[PDB]
Amino acid sequence: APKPIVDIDGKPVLYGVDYFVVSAIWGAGGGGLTVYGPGNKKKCPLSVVQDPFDNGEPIIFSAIKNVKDNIVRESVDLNVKFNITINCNETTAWKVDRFPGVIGWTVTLGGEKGYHGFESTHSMFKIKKAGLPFSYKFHFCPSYPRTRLIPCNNVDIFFDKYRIRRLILTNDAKEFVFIKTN
Ligand SMILES: *[C@@H]1O[C@H](CO)[C@@H](O)[C@H](O)[C@H]1NC(C)=O
């Protein structure tokens, strides 16, 4: 069985609980994760973005397959959602889709929970161990049947026209740690 994902406190990461996913670097490399709009006067939709400093918002993973002990493990497809209140017309769940004013594939909101058919597989991400102490990365390669349209790849950050930090799929990858919210 894939080694378990661990929070900064060395305790296992679980489904159903709030975490902050924060840059694994201290005193640098940005803060944790939030959402944000086009930067165009346009308010919506929201894309997942890294806060330059603060821990950002609480995040909840949820299993694609029932997990007995409820522990998040390496390289397993899972859903991510922010636990928060948003003003847009979409769910808080993460997915990969195109985003306005951003070239490529952006991690945005409006994702699906569970697997049913292809579309749902855009909301499946895997976490995998990374280089730095306590670090993990988000990798996208759903293990469920999907179309060829979205390339398997790592998530990193991108500074777009407005100097905002988007999440996108790209060769390189960002290294985060998980911190229990409470
Ligand atoms: C999500 O946030 C609410 C408060 O808005 C809180 O009551 C709850 O504990 C959090 N987590 C889950 C899993 O609902």
UniProtKB/Swiss-Prot annotation:
Transmembrane segments: none annotated. The keyword Disulfide bond applies. It is found in: Secreted, Extracellular space. Disulfide bonds join C44-C88, C141-C152. Its main location: secreted. It comes from the Eukaryota. Glycans are attached at N83, N89. Keywords: Disulfide bond, Glycoprotein, Protease inhibitor, Secreted, Serine protease inhibitor. PANTHER family: CYSTEINE PROTEASE INHIBITOR 8-LIKE, KUNITZ TRYPSIN INHIBITOR 2. Belongs to the protease inhibitor I3 (leguminous Kunitz-type inhibitor) family. This is Latex serine proteinase inhibitor. It comes from Carica papaya (Papaya).
